[PDB]
Amino acid sequence: IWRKWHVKINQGQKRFATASALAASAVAPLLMARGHQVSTVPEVPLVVDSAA
Amino acid sequence: SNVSADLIWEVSRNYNSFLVKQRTGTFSRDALNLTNQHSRKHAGFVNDKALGIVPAEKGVKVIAKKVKAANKPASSLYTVTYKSTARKAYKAIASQAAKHGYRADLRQAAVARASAILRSQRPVKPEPPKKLRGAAARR
Amino acid sequence: VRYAATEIAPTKSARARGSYLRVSFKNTRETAQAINGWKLQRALTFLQNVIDKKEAVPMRRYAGSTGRTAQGKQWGVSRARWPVKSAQFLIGLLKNAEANADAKGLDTGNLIIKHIQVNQAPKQRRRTYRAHGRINPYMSNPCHIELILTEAEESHLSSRQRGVRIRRALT
Amino acid sequence: GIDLRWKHVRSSHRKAPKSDNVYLKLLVKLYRFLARRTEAPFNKVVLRRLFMSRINRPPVSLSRIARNLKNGNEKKTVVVVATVTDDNRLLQVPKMEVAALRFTAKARARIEAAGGRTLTLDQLALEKPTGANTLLLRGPKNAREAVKHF
Amino acid sequence: IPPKPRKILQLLRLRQINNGVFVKVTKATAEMIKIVEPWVAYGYPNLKSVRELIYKRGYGKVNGQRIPLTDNAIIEENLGKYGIICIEDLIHEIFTVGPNFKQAANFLWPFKLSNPNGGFRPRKFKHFIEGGDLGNREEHINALIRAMN
Amino acid sequence: VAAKKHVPIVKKRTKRFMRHQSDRFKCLDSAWRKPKGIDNRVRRRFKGNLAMPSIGYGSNKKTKHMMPSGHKAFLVHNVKDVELLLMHNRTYAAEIAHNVSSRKRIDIITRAKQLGVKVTNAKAKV
RNA sequence: CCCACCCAUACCCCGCCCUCAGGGUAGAAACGAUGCCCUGAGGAGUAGGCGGCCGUGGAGGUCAGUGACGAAGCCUAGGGC
RNA sequence: CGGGACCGAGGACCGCGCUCUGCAAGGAUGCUGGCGUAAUGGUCACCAGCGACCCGUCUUGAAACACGGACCAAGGAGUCAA
RNA sequence: GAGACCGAUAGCGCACAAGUAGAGUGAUCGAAAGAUGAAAAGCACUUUGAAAAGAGGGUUAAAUAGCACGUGAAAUUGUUGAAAGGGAAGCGCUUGUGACCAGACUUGCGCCCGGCGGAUCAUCCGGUGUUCUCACCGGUGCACUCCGCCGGGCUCAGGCCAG
């Protein structure tokens, strides 16, 4: 049971990777390259009004 | 900025959802990929200017990327359906691919794909019957 | 159930089976090979003679360090024996097949043993006691027997070749 | 059989970066094109130092840059294929134009507060494609715990 | 092979069997060839031997590569600063042993000859004067060049 | 259709490389295993023994992965898979996967017949 | 002593494979640039060192994947790479 | 000036040249016949000519000796932590 | 309550009437062993046998699932078919014979005539979209212009072995 199960990651690297994934989510070629059906999406990034 | 077609190619050159890798070659399922080959020349979703041809009920249907609407996928494609003579379709596709500098390197591939689709839309011929050969197959 | 000889149709043939039969597999194989391909009545008479020690079954494969007899000269061998128990079991199976043929309506006197096959059954596991407090197997080797009785019963030539043959046909 | 007393030697130098950074790959492509299509040995040295690893790219401080900026180098563009770090011991940062792989936040802020310019290597390749009027600097390679323990 | 004849053969660029080279006669080269006499056969070649060797099996060393001598442009690019701009210039330099014999002979890649037609003598590894093939056979090397080329 | 023009297909060796003593032992599969004993005749390459595979047996780069018709096999599972060979009917031949049902096989065969694409196993499940 | 002839994985010429080395390839009609094109040399191997690929159980993503009109497994003097 | 064998790599043009309407000059074309199928090719079984010790393992420098192996299926041995 | 654990030689010794059966004076030691089928629908009735069972004939979607029961490998064995064998077989290279096979091919493309069926031929006008000069759509063709089909002829390219 004392195998090393958990990996400690720097919080700066976690925040870097989260920002990189957020930036990649605004690129529509990468959305299609990840297998998403976004051909009918009017705009990327898709923003919906908070009243809905 | 931080995003370019070169960057998208460096990101998705090893793996993407369109990739079909086998022993005898690597193919692409991309709709904007002429000849369905995994390369920077033919990666339509990577390239800013890109062309793609799909079959229609009669004729071809050609989609092209609009550079001013890259972030608007619903209005990112300029679509023309060619339902006319094959020569007129080839002329219009070649003009669309070469006259204004919109991927003149894809002109031959686009004309070839249009010709292949229009030839596949023709009726097939009946095959000659299989002839039994030898002794065990014949008897 | 499936027989090994699947080519034989069941319309004009009669079959018989016996399984887990506590008789010697080697002796039964020799007896079945002795009566293979024979007429039914000839096989029955020969097996009765084997029981009566009047005719002998030749021992061909399972014959190591057996005895020699004068009754093997009809078979061209010297080693032959009289497996009475195997003869009795095969007589029972042959009479069952004859009854099957009579039920089917075939001609009994025009039947030959087209197929007969003896296979090893799962072995009977007894134990025997030896010296120095040892125990060894004392197994029996039984057999499955099955049998079926049936009624006894110029292209792509060359132009030169064609011209030669036409000229020889004319001449 | 051919008598080969001497042995043909495979290359003992990096021909490609081991890093998987896509932006570094783009920089390597750009400077491969420059080193193939130009006379300048500056582009070849910069492509080499882009191939190099991190222990082979020690950091360069603003105080080291200010030391090398003396004696007629006050107008040369400083090129460092490494990380540029800030030095607290340098109280007055002079005005300088530095191109680097990356800057620390304090070094970039102090350069821009002194009034100089910070550039990336692609901006450097755009503005000085032949490396004209440039001061090429390296950090202390042997200033490491391992090298001291060698 | 002992280390000293091995080193002399490596310096004479005779690193394979049936390799041939041109040597200018000095004492400094003559002593080397006399030491490696138990492995080589050498002699005085005529103009026909020189021109057949250069025309048929002529290869130049260009940037460390073995290039066939099929055009005079290669000779002009590689030996033009010494006045050798053609294959006849190269043949004349080698045959007459001119002032640029070192450069011409080093530009010539070592000749890779075939085995002789008609074979060697019955006992090949003896000296020429004793009925073998080794050593200095003087003008008789031309028949060996005809057989091996 | 007919394949693209190519150089003649040369196989330097058509026989397989059989494992040593796999002929004499049933527990040894015939698939190649390199002998590692120091006194092995095959590993030491005595004459009259089994040959050992090497890169000198490699096939011509222009005709590698070519079937005798000159095509390269591409495994297909459906109609969208076989439509990827629209531009490669002179170089690639479709090959239906073994676990594809008969109805989908008829659909793939019909689509490949329309596209002019050779199917290597078109007679299956008929 | 002389002439002719036999043949080694040795030598010569040609093809093909791999390795190494040297070049070219963007005001891109442009490329699995981790590609392609051109040229040359080399090829045995125990201990030992290094690189790349094949296969098995399971996990995330993906192929709008295969499947009772038959998945997995098994047998096969049947074929392809 | 003849006689024979083996080979035909490349794939628009560019070059060096010549005997210069063209060419044997930076790698084969032209003409013709039979057949269009098991004919070529391939797999398996067997005969024939030549070739060919039974594998690890151990020892030292090496052999020999020695030790393990009737056969088949499934496990089965450089892992984890500091 | 869960798991990037194991999937009946694994995982606890134990998925089963398992700390059971069994061994030992005793302290103690200590297994093997899961799966028919959706449903027993687990074969009526006839016939041969002393019986076990066999054969017909039903049941099932399947008995090639018969309480030896899902799938059913190998060692090893029986039958049938083919073959070899004068004190070993087995293997490598290369033919040959016999047996058995995978490919390839069946025609494509381009012209010149003749006969049909149609006007998504060129130009012009309007609308729309775009790469801003290119297209599509709607009216215009009135058949020496485009697109399909069928008969003939010609050229070229097509498979195997060869001179």
DSSP letter string, D28-61: HHHHHHHHHH-S-HHHHHHHHHHHS-STTS--EE
Compute chain B's Rg from CA coordinates. 20
Q: Which residue is nearest to nucleotide H53 (CA to C1')?
A: F41
Strand partners, C140: C124
Dist CA F94 CA F76 (whole Å): 6
B-A interface (Cβ pairs under 8 Å ≥ 3): yes
- Yes or no: say if C101 and C15 are a contact pair by the CB < 8 Å rule: no
Dist CA C3 CA C145 (whole Å): 10
Instruction: Tell me the three state secondary structure of residue F42.
Output: helix
Dist CA E98 CA E80 (whole Å): 15
Between chains, do E6 and D4 touch, taking CB under 8 Å as contact?
no
Strands C57-58 and C80-81: antiparallel
Dist CA F86 CA D20 (whole Å): 35
Instruction: Tell me the three state secondary structure of residue D5.
Output: coil
DSSP tag of B75: G
Dist CA E84 CA E82 (whole Å): 6
- Yes or no: say if C107 and C98 are a contact pair by the CB < 8 Å rule: no
- The three-point CA angle E44-E48-E50 to 5° equals 60
For the residues of C26-87, what is the DSSP string, one character each?
HHHHHHHHHSTT-BHHHHHHHHHHHHTTSS-EE-SSS-TT--B-GGGTTTT-SBEE--HHHH
- Yes or no: say if D136 and D45 are a contact pair by the CB < 8 Å rule: yes
Search chain B and give the residue with CA nearest F66: B24
Task: Please give the single-letter amino acid code of residue C61.
Answer: R
Dist CA C28 CA E59 (whole Å): 85
Integer CA distances (angstroms), B81 to B85, B119, D101, in order: 12, 16, 49
Task: Please give the single-letter amino acid code of residue A21.
Answer: A
Residue E2 burial (C-beta neighbours within 10 Å; 0-12, 13-18, 19+): exposed
Interchain contact B10–D (C-beta under 8 A):
yes
Dist CA B66 CA B68 (whole Å): 6
Instruction: Tell me the three state secondary structure of residue C152.
Output: coil
Closest CA to F112 of F125, F98, F95: F95
Distance from CA of D136 to the nearest CA of B (A): 27
Dist CA C121 CA C140 (whole Å): 10
Number of H helices, E strands in chain E: 7, 6
**Nucleotide nearest residue F18, measured CA to C1':** I91
Dist CA C165 CA B79 (whole Å): 71
Spacing of C-alpha E40 from chain mean position: 11
- Please tell me the total number of residues recorded for chain B in this structure: 139
Which of residues 11 to 30 on C have a Cβ less than 7 angstroms from any strand H atom?
none
Dist CA E124 CA E134 (whole Å): 7
Dist CA E133 CA E128 (whole Å): 5
Strand partners, B42: none
Distance from CA of D113 to the nearest CA of B (A): 24
First and final C-alpha spacing in chain F: 22
Residue D76 burial (C-beta neighbours within 10 Å; 0-12, 13-18, 19+): middle
Distance from CA of B16 to the nearest CA of A (A): 5
Q: Which of residues 77-106 of B touch A (CB under 8 A)?
A: none
Q: C20 in the Ramachandran plot: left (φ > 0), alpha (ψ -120 to 50) or beta?
A: left
Between chains, do F87 and B35 touch, taking CB under 8 Å as contact?
yes
Q: Give the resolution to one decimal, in Å.
A: 2.5
Is the CB of C162 within 7 Å of strand H? yes
Is the CB of C166 within 7 Å of strand H? no
Q: Does the annotation flag C129 for ligand binding?
A: yes
Q: Which residues of chain F make contact with B31, given a CB cutoff of 8 A? A: none
Token representation of residue E122? 């019955």
Dist CA D121 CA D25 (whole Å): 13
Dist CA B21 CA B13 (whole Å): 12
Dist CA E117 CA E123 (whole Å): 16
Token representation of residue E94? 């080698």
**What is the number of other CB atoms lying within 10 angstroms of the CB of residue B88?**
10
- The three-point CA angle E9-E11-E14 to 5° equals 40
Closest CA to F81 of B117, B112, B29: B29
Please state whether the peptide bond connecting residue D17 to the residue before it is cis, i.e. omega within 30 degrees of 0. no
Q: What are phi and psi of E110, to 5 degrees?
A: -60, 135
Dist CA F61 CA E49 (whole Å): 42
Token representation of residue B68? 């001013």
Between chains, do D26 and B11 touch, taking CB under 8 Å as contact?
no
- Yes or no: say if C50 and C74 are a contact pair by the CB < 8 Å rule: no
Which bases along strand I come within 7 Å of a protein CB atom? 46-49, 51-56, 63-64, 68, 74-80, 89-94, 99-108, 120-122, 129-137, 146-149, 158
Alpha helices in chain E (DSSP H): 3-11, 27-35, 47-57, 72-79, 87-96, 101-107, 141-148
Dist CA B20 CA F76 (whole Å): 11
Instruction: Tell me the three state secondary structure of residue D105.
Output: helix
**Nucleotide nearest residue B138, measured CA to C1':** H38
Number of H helices, E strands in chain F: 3, 2
Q: Which residue is nearest to nucleotide I5 (CA to C1')?
A: A1
Strand partners, F119: F94
Dist CA B47 CA B39 (whole Å): 11
Dist CA E146 CA F6 (whole Å): 42
- Yes or no: say if F79 and F113 are a contact pair by the CB < 8 Å rule: no
Spacing of C-alpha B22 from chain mean position: 20
Integer CA distances (angstroms), F72 to B23, B24, B28, B96, in order: 10, 6, 17, 33
Interchain contact F106–B (C-beta under 8 A):
no
What kind of experiment solved this structure? cryo-EM
Distance from CA of F49 to the nearest CA of B (A): 33
Dist CA F112 CA F86 (whole Å): 9
Biggest alpha carbon distance in chain D? 71
User: Which residues, 6 or more positions from F104, have their beta carbon under 8 angstroms from its beta carbon?
Assistant: F78, F79
Residue with tokens 């002794």: B135
Token representation of residue E125? 């590894």
Dist CA A24 CA A13 (whole Å): 16
Residue C37 exposure: Cα atoms within 13 Å on the Cβ side: 2
The chains in contact with chain A, meaning 3 or more Cβ pairs closer than 8 Å, are: B
